[PDB]
Scaffold this active site. Sequence first.
Site, short mmCIF file in Angstrom:
data_model
loop_
_atom_site.label_atom_id
_atom_site.label_comp_id
_atom_site.label_asym_id
_atom_site.label_seq_id
_atom_site.Cartn_x
_atom_site.Cartn_y
_atom_site.Cartn_z
N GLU B 217 2.37 8.14 9.74
CA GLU B 217 3.48 7.18 9.71
C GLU B 217 4.57 8.12 9.55
O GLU B 217 5.94 7.94 10.11
CB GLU B 217 3.12 6.26 8.94
N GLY B 272 -0.05 9.10 -5.80
CA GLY B 272 0.82 8.67 -5.14
C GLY B 272 1.28 7.03 -5.61
O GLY B 272 2.57 6.84 -5.63
N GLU B 358 -5.49 -0.16 -5.26
CA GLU B 358 -6.07 1.18 -4.67
C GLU B 358 -6.82 2.05 -5.79
O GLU B 358 -7.59 2.74 -5.56
CB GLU B 358 -4.80 1.89 -4.20
N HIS B 389 6.97 -23.46 -5.28
CA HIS B 389 6.97 -24.46 -4.49
C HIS B 389 6.28 -24.02 -3.32
O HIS B 389 6.37 -24.80 -2.10
CB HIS B 389 8.57 -24.74 -3.96
#
Lengths: 557, 557
Positions: B217, B272, B358, B389
């Site tokens: 990615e 990470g 994770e 709400h």
Amino acid sequence: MAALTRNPQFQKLLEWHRANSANLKLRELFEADPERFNNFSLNLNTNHGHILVDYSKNLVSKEVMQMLVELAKSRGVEAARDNMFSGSKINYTEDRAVLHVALRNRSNTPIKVDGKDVMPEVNRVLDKMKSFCQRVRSGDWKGYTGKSITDIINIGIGGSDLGPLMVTEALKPYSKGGPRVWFVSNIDGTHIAKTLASLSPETSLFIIASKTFTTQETITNAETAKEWFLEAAKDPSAVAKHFVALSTNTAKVKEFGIDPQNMFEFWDWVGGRYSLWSAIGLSIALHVGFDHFEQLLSGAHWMDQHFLKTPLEKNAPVLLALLGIWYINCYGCETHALLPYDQYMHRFAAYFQQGDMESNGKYITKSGARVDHQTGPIVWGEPGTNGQHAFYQLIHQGTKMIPCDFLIPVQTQHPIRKGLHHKILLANFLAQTEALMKGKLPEEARKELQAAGKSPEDLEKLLPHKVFEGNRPTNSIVFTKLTPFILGALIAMYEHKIFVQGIMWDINSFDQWGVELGKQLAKKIEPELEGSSAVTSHDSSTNGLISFIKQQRDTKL
Amino acid sequence: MAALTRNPQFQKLLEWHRANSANLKLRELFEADPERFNNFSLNLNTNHGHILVDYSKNLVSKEVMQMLVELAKSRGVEAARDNMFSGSKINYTEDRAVLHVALRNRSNTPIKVDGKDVMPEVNRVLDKMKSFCQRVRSGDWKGYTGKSITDIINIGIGGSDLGPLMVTEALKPYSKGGPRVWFVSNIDGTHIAKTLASLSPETSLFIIASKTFTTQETITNAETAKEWFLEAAKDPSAVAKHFVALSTNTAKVKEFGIDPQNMFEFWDWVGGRYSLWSAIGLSIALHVGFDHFEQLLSGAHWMDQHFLKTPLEKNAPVLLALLGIWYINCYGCETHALLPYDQYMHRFAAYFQQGDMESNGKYITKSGARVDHQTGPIVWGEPGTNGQHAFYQLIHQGTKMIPCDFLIPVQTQHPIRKGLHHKILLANFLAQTEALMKGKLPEEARKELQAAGKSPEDLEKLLPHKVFEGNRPTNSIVFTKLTPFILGALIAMYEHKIFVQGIMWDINSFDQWGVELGKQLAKKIEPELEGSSAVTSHDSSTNGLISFIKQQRDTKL
């Protein structure tokens, strides 16, 4: 007990689960039956794109689906559906009809409430919206200094906010020529303050969305916007140029300074969380144009008709509802994850948190008896592929069973780099549900460790960590393209799923009595916060927290 | 069996739960004991503001807390913690240290890995970040056409995205004078496309954030950004003015073509999801300034010292972790909701979805035994009053038990309307946990319906729907103001909560083997999408979804 648990089709399903669910293994189910995808999927042709509802990666056999369908029938789903569509007052605690399907009733077939067809008034308000959209979008509607409007700010809470926000985000590519849209919902002063900081009073128009026009947070935000506006405009008569209302409270709307010609009405049979299809959707129509808004309604209408006309065994929202029942009431799964592989859909899960959880987060049945079974699940999720690098670790290797709906458009709005990004997105979408089902066998993981040069000691230690048990069920919902029409159909599909589940649980999906207590208590606390005096009127925690607030609010950091 | 279930203190706790938990009623606990708040809360004075951790609205007594503390000692929490802080390789599946605490080690006390102090290199990278931030923020750093930088774009996913995004959102008031910050994370082409459409290649600086620098990615997005940039600049040497890297992989960074002086290093012992404190926080520091970044680090350092030095019975992260264990392993609650009453904190719950899920979404223990108990919960939520709400209906009147942490700053960043908005926000924050605790008895609801003038028939019909069962436990975490320092302390508090729970479950909080399988399967599917030929290589669902994609991708809509 309760209606559901006293039902003999439910008792049979539960008994079958106890005896047989251990035998259900996705790997085995697909290996035994190469027609599995064909027999456990629905490829819907809307004439404006296809929606494929693939439920084959679920822990169900033909016999389980047969039992679930039988249960939907013996719980009165077909009859309840017909009652909704006909205008029967199925919101029984409030004695109200439930007619969001009327709002998008493109066929204009009469739908009566108290003997009176509602479609003339629905279409009257739509026409008003269309006219308003022309005036604002064309630039003909002028602000107090004579300039065209560039920014629209929807002020509203819950249902008056989430729908318009999610839809305008989802349909962003269809907003060329439209004004920028902003959403203010939180009472937290940060929300309105940071919105107003980037705006001009000369070119901003505010949409105040509140049925009663007395909603505390919405009206507070509205009055703050008015204060800001009037500081610049210095003329109470200019308010009518910059503020409109989605409301029925003519008197309060007038008092605020809005021209009552710019009050866009809706009805008590429109639930807040089913309201984007009404006047509440005014910001959608302004952003993407009324033509696109009508396409949104038409997609919903298509799905309403599918739901109405289709035999239960092939009825998309019914089948999705039944799978949810299977996981909630037989497996005991507390949650349901919604995972759209689409950045534009980044607020889709948040929207159905209200839609699902406020509808079906209930414990009292129609008879008044407490349920003795689970009702609505906790809904959550984030768009793919971001979730994969956030929480899919737990989905693959945790101790929870989490039914997931994966959603994706086949065609992207942004086919950059000759479709490279979308190819990768699609591959991840497919890979993830495949992985959830298949897992990774020790024999597969062992060979990977051996090839990586791991010592026999390290291999032995690492092996169980690298195994994926799999057998994790998913739905895959794939559609041609996320257009206004297709988005409308998808939202409607989930609204009807929610409806079916509520009927099966014997609860009222359409009231919200659970908001009352927090509201009452807040009103009591509000005046106590002002001033230095100690507050002792609550439990020691509430008192203690208030003491901390009073002590800490003057500390200079 | 697993370490936790074999532990005698755990079996004692569970047996107590079975015998006694049904007798825990919050309303009655508070009536009986005026000192309850005092005995079940921690008011932490950081010398830079206070953090009140009020855990009194939990289903606990002195006896329960004593047993939980005893369990923590029995599970070796103190020794495990000391091991983390001293650089022991406690990430045992990867044979790595776990030293996010070194990143913010303001004291500069040596912390050794493989006998070498890590602090000189931590501080070297911090100095590099400080210098870079000064150059960009001052406007001294010029783009390829000689213009100052106006926009910073962080390209990264998961741990390389969520931290910096959440912090820059939370600390927005502190960003005056800084460049605008953008986050691109999704591979979905929408994300980079709509970001680049708003930028100029002349004044945009990209930050490519990737621990490995091989994440598909991120590198794909980065290559798309570079192509866009080079189409304008037409000069490969110009890249060095517009692209910097945050990584542990020097080789792969140079391979992408970034100036090695433009590489901000971190280390394998930085997870990470624990990385915003490292070079990964460069976008934070650029946005709010290095001084405010140092304050963020200092806040975390304060909490590290609290965690390290405080007796377990008064230690905030340990107590939060223990209450978690109580709800997860004794009550069986699948989820934990995070509900910050702060619009700036709108990505806080999302951050901790990764951080918690994770980390603790795991099923294999240190001994190699599969867990025979629950591990990490599903974390979810939205900021108040937005979430309020949307989904509180289910929290108040659903069939799920949901431990909630409510968070709020006493002092708002935007005290508009003489504090009116924040008064309402605070009152709701307080009322909601009061409401969850207290509920509303049938007799109390009957009296309310009596007073509203309901007829016997109308009263009896509505009564059960108006009852709130209450006894719903919450944590309230209230702090002076959301400054960089306090935010840092709060994040570290939850990091340590996650640590303690992991040690108690005997799992590795610091690996993430569960991501591998999805990645492998996506690589296999990618090339199969090319062309019009049918795919038969997978299960029938995957094959069928691929057939659908191929059939639908050419349809004009």
